[PDB]
Amino acid sequence: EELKEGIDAVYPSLVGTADSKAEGIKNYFKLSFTLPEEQKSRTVGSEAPLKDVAQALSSRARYELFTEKETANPAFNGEVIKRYKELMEHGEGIADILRSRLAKFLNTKDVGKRFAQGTEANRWVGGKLLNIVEQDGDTFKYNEQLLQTAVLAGLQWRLTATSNTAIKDAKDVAAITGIDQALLPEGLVEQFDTGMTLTEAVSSLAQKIESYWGLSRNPNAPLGYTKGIPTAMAAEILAAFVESTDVVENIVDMSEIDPDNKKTIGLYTITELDSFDPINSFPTAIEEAVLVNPTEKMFFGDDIPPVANTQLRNPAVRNTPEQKAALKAEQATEFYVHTPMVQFYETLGKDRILELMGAGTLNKELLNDNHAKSLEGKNRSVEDSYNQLFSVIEQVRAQSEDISTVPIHYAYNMTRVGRMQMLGKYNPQSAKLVREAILPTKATLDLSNQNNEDFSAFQLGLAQALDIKVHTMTREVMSDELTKLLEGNLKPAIDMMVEFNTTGSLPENAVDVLNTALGDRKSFVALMALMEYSRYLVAEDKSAFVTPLYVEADGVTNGPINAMMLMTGGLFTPDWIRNIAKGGLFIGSPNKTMNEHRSTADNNDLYQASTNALMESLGKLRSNYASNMPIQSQIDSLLSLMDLFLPDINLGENGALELKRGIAKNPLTITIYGSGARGIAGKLVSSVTDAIYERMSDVLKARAKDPNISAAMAMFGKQAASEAHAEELLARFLKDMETLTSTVPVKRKGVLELQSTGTGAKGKINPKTYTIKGEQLKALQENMLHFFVEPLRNGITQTVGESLVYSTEQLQKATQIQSVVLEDMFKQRVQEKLAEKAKDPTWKKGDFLTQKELNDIQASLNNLAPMIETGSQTFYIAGSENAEVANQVLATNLDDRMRVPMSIYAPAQAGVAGIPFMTIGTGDGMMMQTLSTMKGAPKNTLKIFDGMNIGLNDITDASRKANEAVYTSWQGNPIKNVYESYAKFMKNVDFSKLSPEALEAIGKSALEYDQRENATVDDIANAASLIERNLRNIALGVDIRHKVLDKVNLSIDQMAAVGAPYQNNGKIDLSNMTPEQQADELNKLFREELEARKQ
DNA sequence: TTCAAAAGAAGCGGAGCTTC
């Protein structure tokens, strides 16, 4: 109550009166914010924050005094102090630009003079900054404390924002641009991942500014001002940065790409500092000075990151105690620099790292235009990765003499799907380059005898890094394969690394020696293996060799196998038993390992299996159209085009069709996760086109090396055996492209029909500019869709089983129906509140609701059970942050541009999201969380969602714990969890309360195609309750299967490599039984257990 | 309709329709 005179004492001269019922100009800053109970920011109360902080940053002594700490970060030395001095001089220029822009704004259209007359311009979308100005003679001026504090925030953001941005994928870019995901032009995604959208830039900037202001939002102030003022400030700071060239604004015209797309979309990119700029060694000095509890910082020694209370971007959802425990365990792990890898990276040098692991130096005219763009994006990813690692090493180097002795902690958070994600773009969990330089793994091994376990472990890690598939063969067979590699092809690289580990020197042909020796095995962890093997060779005491080399306990087809175990709800089938065996669940085979399975029982994993099913399904398709020669020819051309450019499609001379497990890897995965067939066809086409674009660079590179080469030899020389032999491949290519782009298959009445597009590919090929775009991509996609993907989809269903497919449909419908009601009720209750506000004279259209009001509405939906609980996890599928609820601008810059949509935390339609949320969450999500908190939880690992890096000392026990954690997560019942929540929803939902658009969306999920048209509320309600029943039955089934599976002897090795499977000790023995006998026995127990329930 | 985060710009006027 007396908070009023409290924030007034601090800002006594802001224009206007802090009373919403006052008649003149009202000051919405003092209305929106309060002094906090405990200090959040050290600039609160300061009359000149830029001056005060500049002085604080001017010496180590003055910094320590300002932050009230006895010692400052040692990275804050002389060179870095000088760079921050210069950056403080620059913040003064930003402050100066901001002041001139306010002056321009007050003058134009006499806004200042009208504001002075009583016009409420501080409530316009452009005028919310007038809430932090002060009267100055005949005009107004910024309150200096707020302006400068905001500039300090602007500077910190400028320093570290790019390194904290989300990665954008194809789907993201498709949503942003409004362009179909399957039709995105090459490198467009790259351009958008390189920039920030307006929303992206402004929201992160607004966050920082509001945090530096160090105040609390008033629960009863309108969001229009609580989000609005800091956003308006952010917008002006972005605008200033564009003037100063700290940020480059590029307005990307979508009509240059797709001619009827009228969206123009702004992209903002922060001008990078030099890699060797001292400030990179310590880029958080301002943050750590301004904030009492800084966010951005590195964690050295026993400085442990705090544990997040809520899910990542889901403040409505508290991390459960079990989850918090898991975050605590992972944050506690110490990581250490492996000096030799760092020294290797440095000695190779950024340029050679790029030549080796990226695209090297691009000759933009030996390159096809589209190929050149993926090449850029490849370099980008490696180079930022390199620079980021080296910035971190620069700060670690200051902490101590020996960088390998400095312990490093990483912050983590639980995501929406229950995964423990390391914060930051470039860390060990997320960046392969960094993963081999900063490691939690470490062991002291006795490698003096090649016959002991320590050496075997060592071999296992070398071989897995060297791309030998170690889960498919026993340790012994692995050992021999590794030896053949080390003694053969890898030897000259090994010799080179031996020398490197002696003199510190690399030859000038280092890239060629590495590249040649490694071939397709090339990777960052391979470089580690060559390093560790050569370090071993020259080691003085082999009996105590110290190494961070790891073995990853890696999930075998983890997602699909989890789904099959978690949500198959029928009787047991022998196909299921055989298939689930491919993912490490073995029945009646005590101690059986994945290595033994693959070597003696079944060499086909789930990917191979579906590929084989696709071959059958392709056969069936070719038969139903056996006489249709145009259709036969069209399938032949697709298969030919794939054969020409993809390694996984083999066409032999017999016409024989061999398909490798690889083509099915992504399509199997994303299919279980709700992906439609069209999106799959697109990705397939995208890999075909990518290889073609590449081959076009191969042409230019052979046309320059011998301008007499024939076209066919330039394009297919490296792929053919002769001159005329290459000629027929060129003939296949041109023919395939011709027929696949001029003719598409369409489904009519259940039958495929060929149709002309009239936009077939015609013309002499120009290898530099050559581009499949538009109506031709779509054509390829249509062919890919009906002749390959649809058979593949059938293959997948036959593989993972139709029961699973059925569960996931029901899960999808239920969570979708639920999210539709939530989203629609939320929007309506919002409109009801806004209709009240219109009677309030203090309220203006644009102010929107208060947080308290929004919280009330969010709470009024609890009886619809928006959350899903498991006991250890909480999922909020509908949860989102969107612009559709407020549907209005939040603020603009002082030039009437940079219009930021008012985004509100609110439920939105799930789509198919319920599927991967529950699968990933109760699958690998639950498993890793279990692995982190279980009794005897493995220490010193790096967990990467479905795989775990383990030090060579602990590979046996950690692996067994991992398979035990798998078993624990297989006791889960996600469909039950959805059931519990959906049934509560079903007894509180009023379907008549819904808008017609929401009522129609529900019809789509709950009804067959026919009943949609004109169905009553009671129709779609009766349908929505049918789904509940379906869920109830599935969940009852999963529950019993699980109990029954536990009564039987199981050996689980889903987290494979090491050969250490978990045994459940089921007492019922099913050894010496075929899958058919086993299925009969499990089903007997099933029907037994069913009658347990009834009676 | 795969998940892990959203997301057009800008004149005139003072919101929100409008044209690109």
Q: Which residues of A are annotated as a binding site for ATP?
A: 432-435, 554-559, 665-666
Distance A296 CA to B7 C1' (A): 24
- Contacts of residue A569, defined as CB under 8 A and 6 or more positions apart, other chains included, come to A803, A806, A807, A975, A1033, A1034, A1035, A1036, A1037, A1038, A1041
Task: Give the distance, in angstroms, between the CA of residue A1085 and the centroid of all CA atoms in the same chain.
Answer: 42
Which nucleotide does the CA of A888 lie closest to, via C1'?
B16
Q: Which residues of A are annotated as a binding site?
A: 432-435, 554-559, 665-666, 946
Distance A372 CA to B9 C1' (A): 30
Q: Which of A560, A491, A945, A152 is nearest to A499 (CA)?
A: A491
Nearest CA to the C1' of B1 belongs to which residue?
A: A911
Distance A917 CA to B3 C1' (A): 7
What does the alpha-carbon distance between residue A481 and residue A619 come to, in Å, rounded to a whole number? 37
Counting other chains too, the contacts that A102-108 makes at CB distance below 8 Å and 24 or more residues apart are A102/A129, A102/A133, A102/A140, A102/A141, A102/A142, A102/A894, A103/A139, A104/A894, A105/A894, A105/A895, A106/A139, A106/A140
Nearest CA to the C1' of B10 belongs to which residue?
A: A897
Which nucleotide does the CA of A846 lie closest to, via C1'?
B15
Nearest CA to the C1' of B3 belongs to which residue?
A: A916
Distance A196 CA to B7 C1' (A): 9
Nearest CA to the C1' of B2 belongs to which residue?
A: A675
Which nucleotide does the CA of A264 lie closest to, via C1'?
B8
Looking at 3.30.930.10, 3.40.50.300, 3.50.50.60, 3.30.70.2440, the CATH number of the domain A307-333+406-449+541-557+912-972 comes to: 3.30.70.2440
Domain A334-405 and domain A450-540, same fold? Reply is: yes
Nearest CA to the C1' of B11 belongs to which residue?
A: A896
Per the DSSP assignment, residues forming a β-bridge with A267 are A197, A250
* Resolution (Å) of this entry: 2.5
What is the full DSSP assignment across A1025-1072? HHHHHHHHHHHHHHHHHHHHHHTB-EEE-SEESS---EE---SB--TT
Distance A893 CA to B11 C1' (A): 15
Which nucleotide does the CA of A313 lie closest to, via C1'?
B5
Q: Which of A398, A393, A392 is nearest to A425 (CA)?
A: A392
Nearest CA to the C1' of B12 belongs to which residue?
A: A896
Which nucleotide does the CA of A683 lie closest to, via C1'?
B2
Which nucleotide does the CA of A673 lie closest to, via C1'?
B2
Which nucleotide does the CA of A672 lie closest to, via C1'?
B2
Q: Which of A1062, A878, A1032 is nearest to A961 (CA)?
A: A1062
What does the alpha-carbon distance between residue A856 and residue A836 come to, in Å, rounded to a whole number? 15
Distance A415 CA to B2 C1' (A): 17
Q: Which residues of A are annotated as a binding site for Mg(2+)?
A: 554, 946
- Are residues A292 and A41 in contact, defined by beta-carbon separation less than 8 angstroms? yes
Distance A824 CA to B2 C1' (A): 24
Instruction: Locate the domains of chain A by residue range.
Output: 1-306+878-911, 307-333+406-449+541-557+912-972, 334-405, 450-540, 558-582+1072-1095, 583-603+1048-1071, 604-798, 799-877+973-1047
- Are residues A403 and A492 in contact, defined by beta-carbon separation less than 8 angstroms? no
Per the DSSP assignment, residues forming a β-bridge with A264 are A253
Looking at 3.30.70.20, 1.20.140.110, 1.10.10.1100, 3.40.50.10800, the CATH number of the domain A799-877+973-1047 comes to: 1.20.140.110
Q: Quote the crossing angle between the two packed helices A775-784 and A629-645, to the nearest 10°.
A: 100
Q: Quote the crossing angle between the two packed helices A677-703 and A775-784, to the nearest 10°.
A: 120
Dihedral of alpha carbons A169, A170, A174, A177, sign: positive
Distance A362 CA to B14 C1' (A): 52
Nearest CA to the C1' of B20 belongs to which residue?
A: A262
Alpha helices in A475-523 (DSSP H): 475-487, 491-503, 510-518
Distance A992 CA to B1 C1' (A): 26
Establish how many alpha carbons lie within 13 A of residue A559's alpha carbon, considering only the half-sphere containing its beta carbon: 18
Nearest CA to the C1' of B19 belongs to which residue?
A: A262
Q: Which of A500, A134, A469, A215 is nearest to A341 (CA)?
A: A500
Which nucleotide does the CA of A105 lie closest to, via C1'?
B14
What does the alpha-carbon distance between residue A249 and residue A235 come to, in Å, rounded to a whole number? 13
Alpha helices in A539-605 (DSSP H): 558-567, 574-581, 594-596
Distance A261 CA to B19 C1' (A): 13
Nucleotides of B under 7 A from a protein CB: 1-16, 20
Counting other chains too, the contacts that A571-577 makes at CB distance below 8 Å and 24 or more residues apart are A571/A1079, A571/A1083, A571/A1086, A572/A1041, A572/A1044, A572/A1078, A572/A1079, A572/A1082, A572/A1083, A572/A1086, A573/A801, A573/A1079, A574/A1074, A574/A1075, A574/A1076, A574/A1078, A574/A1079, A575/A801, A575/A1075, A576/A801, A576/A1079, A577/A1075, A577/A1078, A577/A1079
The dotted CATH code for A450-540 is 6.10.140.1370
What is the full DSSP assignment across A843-879? --TTS--BHHHHHHHHHTTGGG---EE-SS-EE-TT-
What does the alpha-carbon distance between residue A479 and residue A497 come to, in Å, rounded to a whole number? 21
Distance A232 CA to B13 C1' (A): 18
State phi, psi for A1089 to the nearest 5 degrees.
-65, -30
- Contacts of residue A553, defined as CB under 8 A and 6 or more positions apart, other chains included, come to A947, A948, A950, A955, A958, A959, A962, A1055, A1056, A1057, A1058
Fold classified for A558-582+1072-1095:
6.10.250
Nearest CA to the C1' of B14 belongs to which residue?
A: A124
Distance A1037 CA to B20 C1' (A): 57
The dotted CATH code for A334-405 is 6.10.140.1360
Experimental method: X-ray
Which nucleotide does the CA of A251 lie closest to, via C1'?
B9
Distances from the Cα of A593 to the Cα of A550, A590, A1082, angstroms: 20, 9, 22
Distance A402 CA to B5 C1' (A): 39
Which nucleotide does the CA of A877 lie closest to, via C1'?
B3
Distance A252 CA to B8 C1' (A): 9
Taking 3-state DSSP, the helix, strand and coil percentages for chain A, each rounded to the nearest 5, stand at 55, 10, 35
- Are residues A417 and A870 in contact, defined by beta-carbon separation less than 8 angstroms? no
- Are residues A934 and A961 in contact, defined by beta-carbon separation less than 8 angstroms? yes
Which nucleotide does the CA of A903 lie closest to, via C1'?
B6
Establish how many alpha carbons lie within 13 A of residue A1059's alpha carbon, considering only the half-sphere containing its beta carbon: 17
CB atoms within 10 A of CB A828: 15
- Are residues A447 and A536 in contact, defined by beta-carbon separation less than 8 angstroms? yes
Tokens coding A395: 């700060």
What does the alpha-carbon distance between residue A24 and residue A18 come to, in Å, rounded to a whole number? 10
Nearest CA to the C1' of B9 belongs to which residue?
A: A264
What does the alpha-carbon distance between residue A159 and residue A83 come to, in Å, rounded to a whole number? 12
State phi, psi for A250 to the nearest 5 degrees.
-120, 115
- Are residues A347 and A501 in contact, defined by beta-carbon separation less than 8 angstroms? no
∠ CA A388-A394-A395, rounded to 5°: 100
Which nucleotide does the CA of A111 lie closest to, via C1'?
B14
Distance A845 CA to B12 C1' (A): 19
The dotted CATH code for A583-603+1048-1071 is 3.30.750.220
